[PDB]
C-alpha cells in the first residue's frame, strides 16, 4: 500500500519495524529500536510517516488509521532534559484540539544512546513523559503522545518505561543474500544474472567487518554495492563484467588503509585498474531511473582535495557552492548554521553541487538528508532538513550532489560511525593523482630547491624564507597545476622536461630577488643562475603590482572569466593612491580596481554585500583586490576566498572577466605562525617585494648590478 | 668540447672548485636538450677521438646514463631506429640500458621473464648483439652477466615448453607475448619451440575449459543453497604456479593425440553434464528449471530439469506449448524481446517471430488490464456510451482456466482484433487511466467546484494563500494544477455518452498531456490525497510576511533585565512589532526564542532574491552582538548601563534608526538615523573598546 522505491530491501527488518511502529503509534506504546547503521530504522520511520498521512494515505489500509505528525529530536551527549520536555510539549500542542482517535503525535528521538550516560541525565525524564506526558503539571489526554526512540547505540531498559525494545543484531550471510535479492527484485533477469555474486559479497562483507578495527564500513556499503552491480547489469543487459564489480567494490569499500576491499572481495576472480578520480567522477557525474549514489566523504591531508576537485572535475561555470565555517571575527554562531542550511536547501532545490569542508557540526541538520530516504510528490523528491526543533521537507533536485571534504584523522577519530556509513568514502591526496614520473619530478624539484637555497654560501636559509608560503606539498601542487593546465597529454621525455621547467618557473615566481641575486653571485655567474635571473626580472613581473596587473590583463585566459591570484609581499599594502594610479594605468580596459580590507569586516554578510556591489557593475573586466595583513588570519583569508568564489559563481551569467588579487602582507622574519601558500588549483601564487612604482629608484633592479654607487651621482 | 676541455684541464688547486663548476655548467647546458638528443650526440657526434679519460667525457657519460635511466623507467624504448657512428659510446649506452631497464629485484625468474618479453629495448639489444659481435666487446661485464642470465631464462623456458613442464603463469605470459618470445629466441639461438608452444596452448585451453565447466556446475547448485546444501579443493588450487604436465597431460613429442585427464579426472558423464550446464548457465529458463546433498545431482536434479527443458525447446520449435506454464515461465520476459530472442537463439545448439506469439500474447494480457481500467474510468467519469466491446476480454479471466489448455494460435480469433484496438495504449497510459479511475470523489469535487479550466487559476491563487509556506505544501498546487490541465479532456469537456471510438479520439489529448509530463498520474493521485485541503481552500499569515513587517516597523529593545532577572540575551533583548496604520492588530511582543524560530522557518521555507531574509538576519545578528556587548559590560561591574535601554528600528521611523536612553539626568536621550547595521556595528565596536 505504501509506495516504495524498487531498490529498497523489503527485508524482514524493515517489515517488522514498520509493523511495530504502526502498532505502537496507533496504541501509543514506547517503541525503542536499536541496531547497527543500515538496520532499516530511519527508513522505517520515513516510510511510516509518509504512509499514515490519514485521509491522504496511499492505501485504504492507512486511510483507516490515525494520522501521524512526527516531532524529531536528535539526542546528543550534550542534550538536556529540557529538550525532551519541550519536544513532548510541542507534540502535545500539535495534539491540542484534535480527534486523538484520528490523529496522533509521535516524539522521535534519534541516537538516544548518545545521551544514555550523559552527566546531565536527560533520559531520566522519559519515564514520566512516556507514562502521562506530564512531569509535574496535571495530566491530560492530549499530553499522552507516541514515542519512537531510534538508536545505533545500546540503551538501558530501566529508562524505557518498560515499553517495547527491539535490538537487531548484525545480519548473517543468508540474511544478506536475501536482502540483496530483495534489492534486485525489480528485474528477475538481472537478478538471476547477479545472484551468483551475492554469497561472495556477503562473505567479503563479514570478513571486512571482522578485520577492520573500528566500524568504518557497514550495511549501507554492501547495499550500495548490490545496487551498483544491479544497475550495471541492467544498463548492460548482460552479465556483469569484472571491471564493474571492481568499480562498485572500490566505490563502496574504499577510504580506509587497513582494508583493501579488493583482494578480499575477489578471492576467486581476476579487474585491471580504477582510480579514486574515476570513482568520484562516477559519484558526481554518474552515467527515469533511481540510480542515485550516496554522497562523498573525500578524505585528505591539508585539504588538498579541495584544490584537486576545483581544478580537475569542475573548471567551467558548473562550479559548486562551498559551505564553510566563517572565519570572520563576529560571524561565529548558530546564525552561521542557519545560513549554511539555507544555502544547502537552495542548492538542493536548484541542482547545484555542494562542498562541505569543515561542516561536521551541520550533521544534526543533514542527518536525514544523507540517508537519501525520499518522499515524493508529483515526481519530485523531498527530504527532511532541520534547524533546532524545526524540521521540514525540502525538495531535492536530481542534479544535486554533496561532497564532504575532511581530514583522515578527524574522520577516523571524531566522526560518528553512522555519518561515515551514510557516505561514500574515498581518500584523495596528490600522490593519488600523480604518476611515477611526476613524483620523481617532485623529488627533483625538492633537490633543485635545496640547491637554490644554498650553493657550494655563508648563511643557511630555509625554503620558506626564499619561496614564500612553501610547505610540504608545494612542489606537488605545482606539478599538479602544471599537468592539469597542459591537458590529458600522455608521458613523453619532452613532456617531463617541460613539466620540470614550468614547475621551476612557477616556484621562482614566489621567490625573492635576493635569492636569485645570491644564486648568481655564489655561483660566480653560471648558466642556471643567469637563466633564473632572466626569468625572474625580465620574463616575469615583480617590480610592482601595476606591471603584474598589466601583464595579466594582456595575457589572461580569454576562455576563463575568473582568474584568482594570491599575492604576498613585505612592503606596505596598497592605498587609494595606488588604486588611482592603477586606474589611470588600466584606463579603457577596466574601471577603478575595487580595494577591500578583510580586517575591516566583522561579518561575512558585509563582505558579501561589498563583493556583490563590486560585481553588480556592468564592466567587462572587474579587478578586485582583497588586502590583508598577516599577523587567525588564514581562516579569514580562506573564508573570504570561498565567499568570493561562490559569489562569482552566482553571477556567472556572461563573459565578463573577473580578476581577483588577494594581497597578504608578511614579515621577512616572522612574528608567529608561518604563512602557508601554494594553495594551487585556481590560484596563481606570486610574491611582489614592493607593490609601489619606486619613484625614488625608477630603475628596474638588475640595473644596479652594472652600476656603482659613484655613477648614481654622475 | 675543445673549449670545455681546455678550460677544465687548467690545473688549478683542486680545493677551489674550477673543474667542478665548469663541468656543472656544461652538464646544465647538456641536460636542457632532450635526453634522446643527448644520447644521439654521445653515440654519433665525433667528439671523443682524444680519449674518454677526460672529466668532460666522464660527465657527459654520467648525464647520458641518467638520461637512459629516466627513459628506461619511462618504458619508452630507445634503440628504435637508432644510428651509431661510435661503438664504444653505443656499448656504454647499451649497457646502461640493459642495467637500468633490468628490474630492481632482478633475481626472480618471473620478473625477468616478463621484462624480456614485454620491453622492446630487449629485442633491439638482442638483435644488435646477434648482428654485430663487435658491440659486445663494448658492453660492460655487468650487462653481459645480465644477458647471460636472460639467455639462461630463455633456455629454461624452452626446455619446459618443448618438454611440457612449465608453470601456467609463464605459459600464459608467453602466449600473450608469443611473438616477442619467438623473436628473442631466434636471435639468441643464432649465437620445435613453435609447435611446442601451440601444443601447450591447446593443453592450457582445455584445462581452462574444464575449469569453466566446473565453475558453471558449481554456480548452478549455488542457487538453491538457501534451501538445500574434493572438487572444490582441486578447482580452488592456484594454477598460476602449478606445472602443466601435472594438471593436464601434456602432449609432447613423446606421444601423439591422447585424452588429457586434467587435475580433476572428470567422468565423461560429468564431462557432458558440465558442458551442458556451461552452455546453458546463461539460460534463465534453465535457471528456473533447476529449482526442484551430495552427487546424484545428475538424474535427481539435472536430468529432470534438462528433459523438461528439451521438451520445452521441442514445443517452442513446434508451437504446441500450452499457455499455462507459458505464463509461468515467460512472465519475466515481458517487454524484453531481446532477452527472449537470445534465450531462443541459444536453443539452436542442435522461429524468430514464432515467439512473436508469446510477445503478442503478452500484449493481449496487457489489453485485458487496460480494458478493465477503461471500465473503471467509464464508472469514474460516469460515461454512458457502449463499452461492452471489451467485455469479451473481461471474460478472458472468466475463461482463463479454460483458455490455458487452448494452445497459442488456438487461443481465439476475436481478440486478435481487440488487441489492435488497444495496441496504442501503453502501460504508462494504463497507469494514467488507472490513477484517474481509482479516484471518484475527487473527480466529482473538481467537476463541481471549478467547472472549467478558466476557473482553475483563481482557485490556484487561493490555494497559494493557504498552502502552508513550505516545499511540499506549496508544490501541492503545482500538483493538481498540472493535473487539472492534463486531465482536462476527461474531467470537464467530455460528453457522458461517448463510446469507444469517441472516447479514444478524446484520450488522444491525454496522450500528449502524458508524453509532456510523465509524472501527471502521480500529481493526480497526490491531489486526490489532498482533497481535504483542496476543499479547505475552496471554503475559504506567513513567516516571510512577518519578516517584512518586522523590517518595516520592528523595534529591537535591548534592556537591563527587570525584576532582578538573570542577565541573558533572552532577558536583555526583545522585539516589538507595532500594528500597521489602520490594521486591527496591536503592538505584538516577541522574545528572542520566537525570533530565532522565525529565522529557522525563513531559512527552511519555500524560498520560491532572499532580500528580506538577509536584512532580517543581518539586523538580528547586529542586535545580538550589541546585547552581548551590553551583557559583558554588565558583568564587568559597569554601573552606567544599569538603566540603559536601546531601541533599534529595523526601518527609519521619523528619521530615527537607533535610539538610546541611559535613564539619567545628565545624559539626554540619544538618537541617530541612517543604516541600522553600520550604526550598530560602530556602536558595538565602541562598547567593546569601552569594555576593554
From Swiss-Prot, chain B:
Q: Tell me how the protein is altered or processed after translation.
A: Autoubiquitinated.
- State where the protein is found: Cytoplasm, Cytosol; Lipid droplet
Name the tissues where it is expressed. Widely expressed (at protein level).
**What happens on changing residue 629 to V?**
Rare variant detected in a sporadic case of Moyamoya disease in East Asian population
Judging by the UniProt lineage, the source's domain of life is Eukaryota
Using the UniProt entry, state the residues involved in the cross-link Glycyl lysine isopeptide (Lys-Gly) (interchain with G-Cter in SUMO2), renumbered to this chain. 208
Q: What switches on its expression?
A: Down-regulated by let-7c miRNA, which binds to the 3'-UTR transcript of RNF213. Induced by pro-inflammatory cytokines.
What is the protein's quaternary organization?
A: Monomer. Interacts with UBE2L3/UBCH7; UBE2L3/UBCH7 is the most efficient ubiquitin-conjugating enzyme E2 for the ubiquitin ligase activity. Interacts with UBE2N/UBC13; promoting 'Lys-63'-linked ubiquitination of target proteins.
Q: What does this protein do?
A: Atypical E3 ubiquitin ligase that can catalyze ubiquitination of both proteins and lipids, and which is involved in various processes, such as lipid metabolism, angiogenesis and cell-autonomous immunity. Acts as a key immune sensor by catalyzing ubiquitination of the lipid A moiety of bacterial lipopolysaccharide (LPS) via its RZ-type zinc-finger: restricts the proliferation of cytosolic bacteria, such as Salmonella, by generating the bacterial ubiquitin coat through the ubiquitination of LPS.
Describe the family membership recorded for this protein in Swiss-Prot or TrEMBL: Belongs to the AAA ATPase family.
UniProt note: domains: Composed of an N-terminal stalk, a dynein-like core comprised of two catalytically active and four inactive ATPase domains, and a C-terminal E3 module. The ATPase regions do not generate movement but rather act like an intricate molecular 'switch'. The RING-type zinc finger domain is required for the ubiquitin-protein ligase activity.
Disease the record associates with this protein: Moyamoya disease 2: A progressive cerebral angiopathy characterized by bilateral intracranial carotid artery stenosis and telangiectatic vessels in the region of the basal ganglia. The abnormal vessels resemble a 'puff of smoke' (moyamoya) on cerebral angiogram. Affected individuals can develop transient ischemic attacks and/or cerebral infarction, and rupture of the collateral vessels can cause intracranial hemorrhage. Hemiplegia of sudden onset and epileptic seizures constitute the prevailing presentation in childhood, while subarachnoid bleeding occurs more frequently in adults.
Name recorded for this polypeptide: E3 ubiquitin-protein ligase RNF213
Tell me what gene encodes this. Answer: RNF213
Whole-protein coverage range: 936 to 1685 of 5207
Amino acid at each position: 500500500g505504501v509506495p516504495l522505491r524498487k531498490t529498497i530491501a523489503k527485508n524482514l527488518a524493515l517489515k517488522e519495524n514498520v509493523f511495530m511502529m504502526v502498532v505502537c503509534i496507533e496504541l501509543k506504546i514506547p517503541l525503542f529500536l536499536v541496531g547497527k547503521p543500515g538496520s532499516s530504522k530511519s527508513l522505517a520511520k520515513t516510510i511510516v510517516a509518509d504512509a499514515m498521512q490519514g485521509p491522504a494515505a496511499y492505501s485504504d489500509l492507512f486511510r483507516s488509521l490515525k494520522q501521524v505528525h512526527l516531532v524529531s529530536f536528535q539526542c546528543s551527549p550534550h542534550s538536556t532534559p529540557q529538550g525532551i520536555i519541550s519536544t513532548f510539549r510541542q507534540c502535545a500542542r500539535f495534539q491540542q484540539g484534535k480527534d486523538l482517535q484520528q490523529y496522533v503525535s509521535v516524539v522521535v528521538l534519534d541516537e538516544v544512546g548518545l545521551a544514555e550516560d550523559s552527566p546531565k541525565m536527560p533520559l531520566k525524564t522519559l519515564h514520566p513523559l512516556l507514562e502521562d506526558g506530564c512531569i509535574e503539571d496535571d495530566p491530560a489526554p492530549h499530553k499522552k503522545v507516541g514515542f519512537v526512540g531510534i538508536s545505533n547505540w545500546a540503551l538501558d531498559p530501566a529508562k524505557m518505561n518498560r515499553g517495547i525494545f527491539v535490538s537487531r543484531g548484525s545480519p548473517n550471510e543468508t540474511e544478506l543474500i536475501e536482502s540483496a535479492k530483495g534489492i534486485c527484485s525489480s528485474d528477475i533477469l538481472v537478478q538471476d544474472r547477479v545472484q551468483g555474486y551475492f554469497a561472495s559479497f556477503a562473505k567479503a562483507y563479514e570478513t571486512v567487518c571482522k578485520r577492520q578495527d573500528k566500524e568504518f564500513f557497514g550495511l549501507r556499503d554492501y547495499y550500495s554495492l548490490i545496487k551498483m552491480v544491479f544497475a550495471a547489469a541492467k544498463a548492460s543487459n548482460r552479465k556483469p563484467s569484472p571491471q564493474d564489480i571492481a568499480q562498485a567494490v572500490l566505490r563502496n569499500f574504499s577510504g580506509k588503509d587497513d582494508i583493501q576491499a579488493l583482494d578480499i572481495f575477489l578471492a576467486n576472480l581476476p579487474s585491471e585498474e580504477v582510480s579514486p578520480m574515476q570513482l568520484i567522477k562516477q559519484n558526481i557525474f554518474g552515467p527515469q531511473e533511481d540510480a542515485e549514489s550516496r554522497y562523498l566523504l573525500v578524505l585528505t591531508k591539508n585539504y588538498v582535495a579541495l584544490q584537486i576537485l576545483q581544478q580537475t572535475f569542475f573548471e567551467g561555470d558548473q562550479q559548486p557552492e562551498i559551505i564553510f565555517g566563517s572565519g570572520f571575527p563576529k560571524d561565529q554562531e548558530y546564525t552561521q548554521l542557519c545560513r549554511n542550511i539555507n544555502r544547502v536547501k537552495i542548492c538542493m532545490e536548484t541542482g547545484k553541487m555542494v562542498l562541505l569542508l569543515n561542516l561536521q557540526n551541520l550533521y544534526e541538520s543533514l542527518y536525514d538528508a544523507l540517508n537519501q530516504y525520499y518522499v515524493h510528490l508529483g515526481g519530485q523528491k523531498y527530504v527532511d532538513l532541520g534547524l533546532g526543533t524545526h524540521r521540514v521537507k525540502c525538495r531535492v533536485h536530481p542534479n544535486f550532489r554533496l561532497i564532504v571534504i575532511e581530514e583522515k584523522d578527524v574522520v577516523y577519530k571524531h566522526f560518528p560511525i553512522p555519518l561515515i556509513n551514510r557516505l561514500e568514502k574515498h581518500y584523495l591526496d596528490i600522490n593519488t593523482v600523480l604518476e611515477k614520473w611526476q613524483k620523481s619530478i617532485v623529488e627533483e624539484l625538492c633537490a633543485w630547491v635545496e640547491k637554490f637555497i644554498n650553493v657550494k654560501k655563508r648563511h643557511k636559509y630555509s625554503p620558506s624564507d626564499v619561496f614564500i608560503g612553501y610547505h610540504s606539498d608545494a612542489c606537488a601542487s605545482v606539478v599538479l597545476q602544471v599537468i592539469e593546465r597542459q591537458g590529458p597529454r600522455a608521458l613523453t621525455e619532452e613532456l617531463h622536461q617541460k613539466v620540470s621547467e614550468e614547475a621551476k618557473s612557477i616556484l621562482l615566481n614566489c621567490a625573492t630577488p635576493d635569492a636569485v641575486v645570491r644564486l648568481s653571485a655564489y655561483s660566480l655567474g653560471g648558466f642556471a643562475a643567469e637563466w633564473l635571473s632572466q626569468e625572474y626580472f625580465h620574463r616575469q613581473r615583480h617590480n610592482s603590482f601595476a606591471d603584474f596587473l598589466q601583464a595579466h590583463l594582456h595575457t589572461a585566459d580569454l576562455e576563463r572569466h575568473a582568474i584568482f591570484t594570491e599575492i604576498t609581499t613585505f612592503s606596505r599594502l596598497l592605498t587609494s593612491h595606488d588604486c588611482e594610479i592603477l586606474e589611470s594605468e588600466v584606463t579603457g580596459r577596466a574601471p577603478k580596481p575595487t580595494l577591500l580590507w578583510l580586517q575591516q569586516f566583522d561579518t561575512e554578510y558585509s563582505f558579501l554585500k561589498e563583493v556583490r556591489n563590486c560585481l553588480t557593475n556592468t564592466a567587462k573586466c572587474k579587478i578586485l583586490i582583497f588586502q590583508t595583513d598577516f599577523e587567525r588570519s588564514a581562516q579569514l583569508i580562506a573564508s573570504a576566498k570561498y565567499s568570493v568564489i561562490n559569489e562569482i559563481n552566482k553571477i556567472r551569467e556572461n563573459e565578463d572577466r573577473i580578476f581577483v588579487y588577494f594581497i597578504t602582507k608578511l614579515s621577512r622574519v616572522g612574528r608567529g605562525t608561518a604563512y602557508v601558500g601554494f594553495h594551487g588549483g585556481l590560484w596563481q601564487s606570486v610574491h611582489i617585494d614592493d607593490l609601489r612604482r619606486s619613484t625614488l629608484m625608477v630603475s628596474d633592479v638588475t640595473r644596479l648590478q652594472h652600476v656603482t654607487i659613484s655613477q648614481l651621482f654622475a | 668540447i675543445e673549449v670545455w676541455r681546455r678550460l677544465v684541464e687548467i690545473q688549478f688547486p683542486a680545493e677551489h672548485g674550477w673543474k667542478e663548476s665548469l663541468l656543472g655548467d656544461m652538464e646544465w647546458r647538456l641536460t636542457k636538450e632532450e635526453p634522446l638528443s643527448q644520447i644521439t650526440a654521445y653515440c654519433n657526434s665525433c667528439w671523443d677521438t682524444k680519449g674518454l679519460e677526460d672529466s668532460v667525457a666522464k660527465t657527459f657519460e654520467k648525464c647520458i646514463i641518467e638520461a637512459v635511466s629516466s627513459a628506461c623507467q619511462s618504458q619508452t624504448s630507445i634503440l628504435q631506429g637508432f644510428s651509431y657512428s661510435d661503438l664504444r659510446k653505443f656499448g656504454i649506452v647499451l649497457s646502461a640500458v640493459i642495467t637500468k631497464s633490468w628490474p630492481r629485484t632482478a633475481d626472480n625468474f618471473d620478473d625477468i621473464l616478463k621484462h624480456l618479453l614485454t620491453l622492446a629495448d630487449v629485442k633491439h639489444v638482442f638483435r644488435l648483439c646477434g648482428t654485430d659481435e663487435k658491440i659486445l666487446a663494448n658492453v660492460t661485464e655487468d650487462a653481459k652477466r645480465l644477458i647471460a642470465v636472460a639467455d639462461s631464462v630463455l633456455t629454461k623456458v624452452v626446455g619446459d615448453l618443448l618438454s611440457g613442464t612449465i608453470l601456467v603463469g609463464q605459459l600464459e605470459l608467453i602466449i600473450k607475448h608469443k611473438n616477442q618470445f619467438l623473436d628473442i629466441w631466434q636471435l639468441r639461438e643464432k649465437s620445435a619451440v613453435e609447435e611446442a608452444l601451440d601444443w601447450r596452448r591447446e593443453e592450457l585451453l582445455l584445462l581452462k575449459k574444464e575449469k569453466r565447466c566446473v565453475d558453471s556446475l558449481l554456480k548452478m547448485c549455488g542457487n538453491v543453497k538457501h534451501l538445500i546444501q574434493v572438487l572444490a579443493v582441486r578447482h580452488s588450487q592456484d594454477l598460476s604456479s602449478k606445472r602443466l604436465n601435472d594438471t593436464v597431460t601434456v602432449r609432447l613429442s613423446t606421444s601423439s593425440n591422447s585424452q588429457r585427464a586434467t587435475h580433476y579426472h572428470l567422468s565423461s558423464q560429468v564431462q557432458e553434464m558440465a558442458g551442458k550446464i556451461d552452455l546453458l548457465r546463461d539460460s534463465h529458463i534453465f535457471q528456473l528449471f533447476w529449482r526442484e546433498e551430495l552427487e546424484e545431482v545428475y538424474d535427481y536434479l539435472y536430468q529432470p530439469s534438462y528433459r523438461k527443458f528439451i521438451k520445452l525447446h521441442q514445443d517452442l520449435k513446434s508451437g504446441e506449448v500450452t499457455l499455462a506454464e507459458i505464463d509461468v515461465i515467460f512472465k519475466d520476459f515481458v517487454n524484453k524481446y531481446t532477452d527472449l530472442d537470445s534465450e531462443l537463439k541459444i536453443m539452436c545448439t542442435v522461429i524468430k517471430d514464432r515467439v512473436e506469439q508469446i510477445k503478442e500474447y503478452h500484449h493481449l494480457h496487457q489489453a485485458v488490464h487496460a480494458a478493465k481500467v477503461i471500465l473503471q474510468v467509464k464508472e469514474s467519469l460516469g460515461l454512458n456510451g457502449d463499452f461492452s466491446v471489451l467485455n469479451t476480454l473481461l471474460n478472458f479471466t472468466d475463461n482463463f482456466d479454460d483458455f490455458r489448455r487452448e494452445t497459442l494460435d488456438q487461443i481465439n480469433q476475436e481478440l486478435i482484433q481487440a488487441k489492435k484496438l488497444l495496441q496504442d495504449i501503453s502501460e504508462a497510459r494504463c497507469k494514467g487511466l488507472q490513477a484517474l479511475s481509482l479516484r471518484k470523489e475527487f473527480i466529482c469535487w473538481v467537476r463541481e467546484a471549478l467547472g472549467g479550466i478558466n476557473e482553475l487559476k483563481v482557485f490556484v491563487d487561493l490555494a497559494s494563500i493557504s498552502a502552508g509556506e513550505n516545499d511540499i505544501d506549496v508544490d501541492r498546487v503545482a500538483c493538481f494544477h498540472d493535473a487539472v490541465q492534463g486531465y482536462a479532456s476527461l474531467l470537464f469537456k467530455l460528453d457522458p455518452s461517448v463510446d469507444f471510438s469517441a472516447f479514444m479520439k478524446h484520450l488522444k489529448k491525454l496522450w500528449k498531456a502524458l508524453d509532456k509530463d510523465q509524472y501527471l498520474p502521480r500529481k493526480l493521485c497526490d491531489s486526490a490525497r489532498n482533497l481535504e485541503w483542496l476543499k479547505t481552500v475552496n471554503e475559504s499569515r506567513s513567516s516571510l510576511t512577518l519578516a517584512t513587517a518586522i523590517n518595516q516597523r520592528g523595534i529591537y529593545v535591548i534592556q537591563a533585565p527587570k525584576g532582578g532577572q538573570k542577565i541573558s540575551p533572552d532577558t536583555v533583548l526583545h522585539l516589538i512589532l507595532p500594528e500597521s496604520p489602520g490594521s486591527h492588530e496591536e503592538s505584538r511582543e516577541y522574545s528572542l526564542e520566537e525570533v530565532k524560530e522565525l529565522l529557522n522557518k525563513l531559512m527552511l521555507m519555500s524560498g520560491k532574491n532572499n532580500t528580506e531574509v538577509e536584512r532580517f538576519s543581518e539586523v538580528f545578528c547586529s542586535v545580538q552582538r550589541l546585547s552581548q556587548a551590553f551583557i559583558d559590560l554588565h558583568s564587568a561591574g559597569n554601573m552606567l548601563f544599569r538603566t540603559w535601554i536601546a531601541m533599534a528600528y529595523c526601518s527609519p521611523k521619523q528619521g530615527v534608526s537607533l535610539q538610546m536612553d541611559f535613564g539619567l539626568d545628565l545624559v539626554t536621550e540619544l538618537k541617530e538615523g541612517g543604516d541600522v547595521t553600520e550604526l550598530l556595528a560602530a556602536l558595538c565596536r565602541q562598547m567593546e573598546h569601552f569594555l576593554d
